[PDB]
Amino acid sequence: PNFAGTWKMRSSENFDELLKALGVNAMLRKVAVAAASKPHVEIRQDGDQFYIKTSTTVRTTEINFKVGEGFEEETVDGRKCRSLPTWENENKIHCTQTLLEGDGPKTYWTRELANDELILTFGADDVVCTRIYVRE
Amino acid sequence: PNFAGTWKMRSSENFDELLKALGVNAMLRKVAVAAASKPHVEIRQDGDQFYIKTSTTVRTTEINFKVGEGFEEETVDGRKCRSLPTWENENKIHCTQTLLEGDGPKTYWTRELANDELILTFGADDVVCTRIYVRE
Numbered sequence: 485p486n487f488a489g490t491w492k493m494r495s496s497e498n499f500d501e502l503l504k505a506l507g508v509n510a511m512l513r514k515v516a517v518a519a520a521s522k523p524h525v526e527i528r529q530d531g532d533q534f535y536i537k538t539s540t541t542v543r544t545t546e547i548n549f550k551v552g553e554g555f556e557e558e559t560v561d562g563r564k565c566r567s568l569p570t571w572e573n574e575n576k577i578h579c580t581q582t583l584l585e586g587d588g589p590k591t592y593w594t595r596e597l598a599n600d601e602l603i604l605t606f607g608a609d610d611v612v613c614t615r616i617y618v619r620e
Numbered sequence: 621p622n623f624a625g626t627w628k629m630r631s632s633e634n635f636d637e638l639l640k641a642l643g644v645n646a647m648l649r650k651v652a653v654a655a656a657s658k659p660h661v662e663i664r665q666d667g668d669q670f671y672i673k674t675s676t677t678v679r680t681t682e683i684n685f686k687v688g689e690g691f692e693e694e695t696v697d698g699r700k701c702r703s704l705p706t707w708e709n710e711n712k713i714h715c716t717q718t719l720l721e722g723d724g725p726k727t728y729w730t731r732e733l734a735n736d737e738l739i740l741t742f743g744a745d746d747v748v749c750t751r752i753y754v755r756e
Protein backbone atom coordinates (compact mmCIF):
# COMPACT_ATOMS: atom_id res chain seq x y z
CA PRO A 485 0.00 0.00 0.00
CA ASN A 486 1.22 3.59 0.35
CA PHE A 487 2.62 4.51 3.76
CA ALA A 488 4.90 6.97 1.98
CA GLY A 489 4.62 10.63 2.93
CA THR A 490 5.04 13.06 5.84
CA TRP A 491 2.69 12.45 8.75
CA LYS A 492 1.45 14.50 11.71
CA MET A 493 -0.31 13.01 14.73
CA ARG A 494 -4.05 13.39 15.31
CA SER A 495 -4.69 11.70 18.65
CA SER A 496 -2.95 9.37 21.07
CA GLU A 497 -4.30 7.04 23.75
CA ASN A 498 -2.11 5.47 26.48
CA PHE A 499 1.47 6.69 25.88
CA ASP A 500 2.15 7.55 29.52
CA GLU A 501 0.58 4.28 30.61
CA LEU A 502 2.87 2.57 28.08
CA LEU A 503 6.05 4.32 29.28
CA LYS A 504 4.93 3.73 32.87
CA ALA A 505 4.64 0.02 32.01
CA LEU A 506 8.14 0.04 30.48
CA GLY A 507 9.64 1.29 33.73
CA VAL A 508 10.43 4.95 32.97
CA ASN A 509 10.16 7.18 36.05
CA ALA A 510 7.75 10.15 36.42
CA MET A 511 10.57 12.65 36.02
CA LEU A 512 11.32 11.28 32.52
CA ARG A 513 7.79 10.39 31.40
CA LYS A 514 6.83 14.06 31.80
CA VAL A 515 9.61 14.91 29.33
CA ALA A 516 8.88 12.05 26.97
CA VAL A 517 5.14 12.54 26.69
CA ALA A 518 5.46 16.32 26.33
CA ALA A 519 7.98 16.00 23.47
CA ALA A 520 6.21 12.93 22.16
CA SER A 521 3.13 15.11 21.64
CA LYS A 522 4.40 16.83 18.52
CA PRO A 523 6.26 14.19 16.51
CA HIS A 524 7.00 14.69 12.84
CA VAL A 525 7.17 11.53 10.77
CA GLU A 526 8.60 10.99 7.29
CA ILE A 527 8.14 7.62 5.63
CA ARG A 528 9.83 6.46 2.41
CA GLN A 529 8.58 3.15 0.98
CA ASP A 530 9.70 1.03 -1.98
CA GLY A 531 7.54 -2.07 -2.04
CA ASP A 532 8.85 -3.81 1.06
CA GLN A 533 11.78 -1.50 1.76
CA PHE A 534 10.82 1.09 4.35
CA TYR A 535 12.59 4.09 5.86
CA ILE A 536 10.83 5.51 8.90
CA LYS A 537 12.15 8.70 10.49
CA THR A 538 10.34 9.78 13.65
CA SER A 539 11.52 13.13 14.93
CA THR A 540 10.70 14.88 18.22
CA THR A 541 12.53 17.45 20.34
CA VAL A 542 14.32 15.14 22.82
CA ARG A 543 14.75 12.16 20.48
CA THR A 544 14.79 11.41 16.79
CA THR A 545 14.91 7.95 15.26
CA GLU A 546 15.48 6.53 11.82
CA ILE A 547 14.81 2.90 10.94
CA ASN A 548 15.33 1.17 7.62
CA PHE A 549 13.89 -2.30 7.20
CA LYS A 550 12.59 -4.74 4.57
CA VAL A 551 9.36 -6.44 5.61
CA GLY A 552 10.11 -10.02 6.47
CA GLU A 553 13.79 -9.46 7.17
CA GLY A 554 14.55 -8.84 10.83
CA PHE A 555 16.56 -5.83 11.98
CA GLU A 556 18.06 -4.15 15.02
CA GLU A 557 16.28 -1.12 16.39
CA GLU A 558 15.32 0.29 19.80
CA THR A 559 12.27 -0.33 21.96
CA VAL A 560 10.31 2.95 22.64
CA ASP A 561 12.09 3.53 25.92
CA GLY A 562 15.46 3.31 24.19
CA ARG A 563 16.52 -0.31 24.80
CA LYS A 564 18.20 -2.48 22.17
CA CYS A 565 16.30 -5.23 20.38
CA ARG A 566 16.08 -7.24 17.17
CA SER A 567 12.66 -7.03 15.57
CA LEU A 568 10.93 -9.03 12.81
CA PRO A 569 8.38 -7.10 10.67
CA THR A 570 5.74 -9.14 8.84
CA TRP A 571 2.72 -8.24 6.71
CA GLU A 572 -0.21 -9.19 8.94
CA ASN A 573 -2.54 -7.96 6.19
CA GLU A 574 -2.28 -6.15 2.87
CA ASN A 575 -1.75 -2.79 4.62
CA LYS A 576 -0.66 -3.69 8.12
CA ILE A 577 2.81 -4.57 9.40
CA HIS A 578 3.23 -6.44 12.67
CA CYS A 579 6.68 -6.16 14.23
CA THR A 580 7.76 -8.46 17.05
CA GLN A 581 10.57 -7.23 19.25
CA THR A 582 13.06 -9.06 21.49
CA LEU A 583 15.53 -7.34 23.82
CA LEU A 584 19.18 -8.24 23.41
CA GLU A 585 19.61 -7.08 27.03
CA GLY A 586 18.09 -9.88 29.13
CA ASP A 587 15.02 -8.83 31.14
CA GLY A 588 11.96 -6.88 30.01
CA PRO A 589 8.29 -6.91 28.84
CA LYS A 590 7.04 -8.50 25.63
CA THR A 591 7.09 -5.47 23.32
CA TYR A 592 5.75 -5.08 19.76
CA TRP A 593 4.53 -2.50 17.26
CA THR A 594 2.08 -2.49 14.35
CA ARG A 595 1.72 0.22 11.69
CA GLU A 596 -1.46 0.04 9.58
CA LEU A 597 -2.88 2.28 6.82
CA ALA A 598 -6.63 2.65 7.49
CA ASN A 599 -7.77 5.09 4.83
CA ASP A 600 -5.35 7.97 4.38
CA GLU A 601 -4.76 7.44 8.12
CA LEU A 602 -1.87 5.70 9.85
CA ILE A 603 -2.84 3.82 12.98
CA LEU A 604 0.35 3.16 15.00
CA THR A 605 0.21 0.70 17.91
CA PHE A 606 2.72 -0.02 20.66
CA GLY A 607 2.29 -2.93 22.98
CA ALA A 608 4.09 -3.80 26.18
CA ASP A 609 2.26 -6.47 28.17
CA ASP A 610 -1.52 -5.87 28.08
CA VAL A 611 -0.86 -2.16 27.62
CA VAL A 612 -1.73 -0.96 24.14
CA CYS A 613 -0.98 2.58 23.08
CA THR A 614 -2.62 3.81 19.90
CA ARG A 615 -1.39 6.90 18.12
CA ILE A 616 -3.19 7.95 14.94
CA TYR A 617 -1.34 9.86 12.24
CA VAL A 618 -2.66 11.92 9.32
CA ARG A 619 -1.06 13.11 6.08
CA GLU A 620 0.22 16.65 6.62
CA PRO B 621 34.63 38.83 37.20
CA ASN B 622 32.64 37.95 34.08
CA PHE B 623 30.87 34.59 34.18
CA ALA B 624 28.22 36.11 31.91
CA GLY B 625 27.64 34.46 28.55
CA THR B 626 26.52 31.21 26.90
CA TRP B 627 28.76 28.24 27.61
CA LYS B 628 29.34 24.83 25.99
CA MET B 629 31.20 21.99 27.68
CA ARG B 630 34.72 20.96 26.68
CA SER B 631 35.51 17.94 28.86
CA SER B 632 34.18 16.19 31.94
CA GLU B 633 35.83 13.87 34.44
CA ASN B 634 33.87 11.72 36.94
CA PHE B 635 30.16 12.45 36.37
CA ASP B 636 29.09 8.80 36.43
CA GLU B 637 31.25 8.19 39.47
CA LEU B 638 29.55 11.22 41.05
CA LEU B 639 26.00 10.04 40.26
CA LYS B 640 27.00 6.53 41.33
CA ALA B 641 28.14 8.03 44.65
CA LEU B 642 24.82 9.88 45.02
CA GLY B 643 22.89 6.63 44.79
CA VAL B 644 21.37 6.77 41.29
CA ASN B 645 20.96 3.32 39.73
CA ALA B 646 22.64 2.16 36.47
CA MET B 647 19.37 2.37 34.56
CA LEU B 648 19.15 6.13 35.31
CA ARG B 649 22.85 7.02 35.23
CA LYS B 650 22.97 5.85 31.60
CA VAL B 651 20.23 8.39 30.84
CA ALA B 652 21.70 11.15 32.96
CA VAL B 653 25.26 10.95 31.67
CA ALA B 654 24.14 10.63 28.05
CA ALA B 655 21.94 13.74 28.27
CA ALA B 656 24.41 15.42 30.59
CA SER B 657 26.96 15.19 27.77
CA LYS B 658 25.55 18.05 25.75
CA PRO B 659 24.43 20.70 28.23
CA HIS B 660 23.83 24.27 27.16
CA VAL B 661 24.47 26.90 29.80
CA GLU B 662 23.41 30.55 29.89
CA ILE B 663 24.70 32.75 32.69
CA ARG B 664 23.50 36.28 33.48
CA GLN B 665 25.53 38.17 36.11
CA ASP B 666 25.07 41.58 37.76
CA GLY B 667 27.87 41.99 40.29
CA ASP B 668 26.77 39.42 42.85
CA GLN B 669 23.37 38.61 41.38
CA PHE B 670 23.59 35.50 39.23
CA TYR B 671 21.12 33.64 37.01
CA ILE B 672 22.33 30.22 35.92
CA LYS B 673 20.26 28.22 33.45
CA THR B 674 21.59 24.74 32.70
CA SER B 675 19.63 22.99 29.99
CA THR B 676 19.86 19.36 28.82
CA THR B 677 17.38 16.99 27.16
CA VAL B 678 15.99 15.19 30.23
CA ARG B 679 16.36 18.07 32.70
CA THR B 680 16.71 21.83 32.68
CA THR B 681 17.44 23.98 35.70
CA GLU B 682 17.40 27.67 36.47
CA ILE B 683 18.91 29.13 39.64
CA ASN B 684 18.97 32.75 40.72
CA PHE B 685 21.16 33.66 43.68
CA LYS B 686 23.11 36.55 45.21
CA VAL B 687 26.57 35.51 46.40
CA GLY B 688 26.57 35.42 50.16
CA GLU B 689 22.81 35.02 50.51
CA GLY B 690 21.71 31.40 50.81
CA PHE B 691 19.03 29.92 48.56
CA GLU B 692 17.02 26.79 47.88
CA GLU B 693 18.01 24.71 44.89
CA GLU B 694 18.43 21.02 44.05
CA THR B 695 21.40 18.71 44.47
CA VAL B 696 22.56 17.22 41.07
CA ASP B 697 20.50 14.10 41.55
CA GLY B 698 17.37 16.18 42.08
CA ARG B 699 17.09 16.36 45.89
CA LYS B 700 16.08 19.52 47.77
CA CYS B 701 18.64 21.58 49.65
CA ARG B 702 19.49 25.07 50.88
CA SER B 703 22.87 26.24 49.67
CA LEU B 704 25.16 29.13 50.67
CA PRO B 705 27.36 30.60 47.87
CA THR B 706 30.48 32.50 48.92
CA TRP B 707 33.37 34.09 47.01
CA GLU B 708 36.28 31.79 47.79
CA ASN B 709 38.46 34.01 45.58
CA GLU B 710 38.01 36.94 43.22
CA ASN B 711 36.66 34.65 40.47
CA LYS B 712 35.57 31.52 42.27
CA ILE B 713 32.31 30.79 44.07
CA HIS B 714 32.11 27.99 46.61
CA CYS B 715 28.59 26.76 47.35
CA THR B 716 27.87 24.56 50.35
CA GLN B 717 24.72 22.47 50.19
CA THR B 718 22.56 20.88 52.90
CA LEU B 719 19.63 18.54 52.22
CA LEU B 720 16.31 19.48 53.73
CA GLU B 721 15.41 15.77 53.45
CA GLY B 722 17.37 14.08 56.25
CA ASP B 723 20.01 11.60 55.04
CA GLY B 724 22.63 12.03 52.33
CA PRO B 725 26.28 12.80 51.38
CA LYS B 726 28.05 16.11 51.99
CA THR B 727 27.48 17.81 48.63
CA TYR B 728 28.92 21.07 47.26
CA TRP B 729 29.70 22.90 44.03
CA THR B 730 32.26 25.49 42.94
CA ARG B 731 32.19 27.55 39.73
CA GLU B 732 35.46 29.32 38.83
CA LEU B 733 36.52 31.45 35.83
CA ALA B 734 40.05 30.34 34.86
CA ASN B 735 40.80 32.36 31.75
CA ASP B 736 37.84 32.52 29.39
CA GLU B 737 37.15 29.03 30.78
CA LEU B 738 34.60 27.96 33.38
CA ILE B 739 35.76 25.15 35.62
CA LEU B 740 32.68 23.63 37.31
CA THR B 741 33.17 21.23 40.24
CA PHE B 742 30.72 18.94 41.98
CA GLY B 743 31.63 17.16 45.16
CA ALA B 744 29.86 14.38 47.01
CA ASP B 745 32.10 12.75 49.61
CA ASP B 746 35.66 12.34 48.25
CA VAL B 747 34.24 12.17 44.74
CA VAL B 748 35.04 15.24 42.70
CA CYS B 749 33.60 15.71 39.25
CA THR B 750 35.13 18.41 37.09
CA ARG B 751 33.37 19.70 34.01
CA ILE B 752 35.09 22.42 31.99
CA TYR B 753 33.04 24.90 29.99
CA VAL B 754 34.05 27.23 27.15
CA ARG B 755 32.43 30.34 25.67
CA GLU B 756 30.38 29.28 22.65
Ligand SMILES: CC1=C(/C=C/C(C)=C/C=C/C(C)=C/C(=O)O)C(C)(C)CCC1
Pocket residue numbers: 503508512515516517519520523538539540542543560561562604615651678
Ligand atom coordinates in the same frame (compact mmCIF):
# COMPACT_ATOMS: atom_id res chain seq x y z
C1 LIG C 1 11.17 7.05 26.68
C2 LIG C 1 12.27 8.07 26.98
C3 LIG C 1 12.55 9.21 26.29
C4 LIG C 1 11.72 9.75 25.19
C5 LIG C 1 11.01 9.07 24.28
C6 LIG C 1 10.23 9.64 23.20
C7 LIG C 1 10.15 11.16 23.03
C8 LIG C 1 9.55 8.80 22.40
C9 LIG C 1 8.74 9.23 21.28
C10 LIG C 1 8.09 8.31 20.57
C11 LIG C 1 7.28 8.63 19.41
C12 LIG C 1 7.17 10.10 18.98
C13 LIG C 1 6.64 7.63 18.76
C14 LIG C 1 5.78 7.73 17.57
O1 LIG C 1 4.84 8.56 17.57
O2 LIG C 1 6.01 7.00 16.58
C15 LIG C 1 13.69 10.19 26.72
C16 LIG C 1 14.46 10.67 25.49
C17 LIG C 1 13.07 11.42 27.45
C18 LIG C 1 14.68 9.46 27.66
C19 LIG C 1 14.05 8.59 28.70
C20 LIG C 1 13.17 7.54 28.11
Ligand SMILES: CC1=C(/C=C/C(C)=C/C=C/C(C)=C/C(=O)O)C(C)(C)CCC1
Pocket residue numbers: 511639644648651652653655656659674675676678679696697698740751
Ligand atom coordinates in the same frame (compact mmCIF):
# COMPACT_ATOMS: atom_id res chain seq x y z
C1 LIG D 1 20.58 12.61 38.14
C2 LIG D 1 19.26 12.23 37.45
C3 LIG D 1 18.79 12.72 36.27
C4 LIG D 1 19.54 13.62 35.36
C5 LIG D 1 20.44 14.56 35.68
C6 LIG D 1 21.14 15.42 34.76
C7 LIG D 1 20.90 15.30 33.25
C8 LIG D 1 22.04 16.29 35.27
C9 LIG D 1 22.80 17.23 34.46
C10 LIG D 1 23.68 18.03 35.07
C11 LIG D 1 24.47 19.01 34.36
C12 LIG D 1 24.28 19.15 32.84
C13 LIG D 1 25.35 19.77 35.06
C14 LIG D 1 26.24 20.82 34.55
O1 LIG D 1 26.97 20.57 33.57
O2 LIG D 1 26.23 21.95 35.09
C15 LIG D 1 17.44 12.24 35.65
C16 LIG D 1 16.65 13.43 35.09
C17 LIG D 1 17.73 11.23 34.50
C18 LIG D 1 16.57 11.56 36.74
C19 LIG D 1 17.31 10.65 37.66
C20 LIG D 1 18.44 11.32 38.37
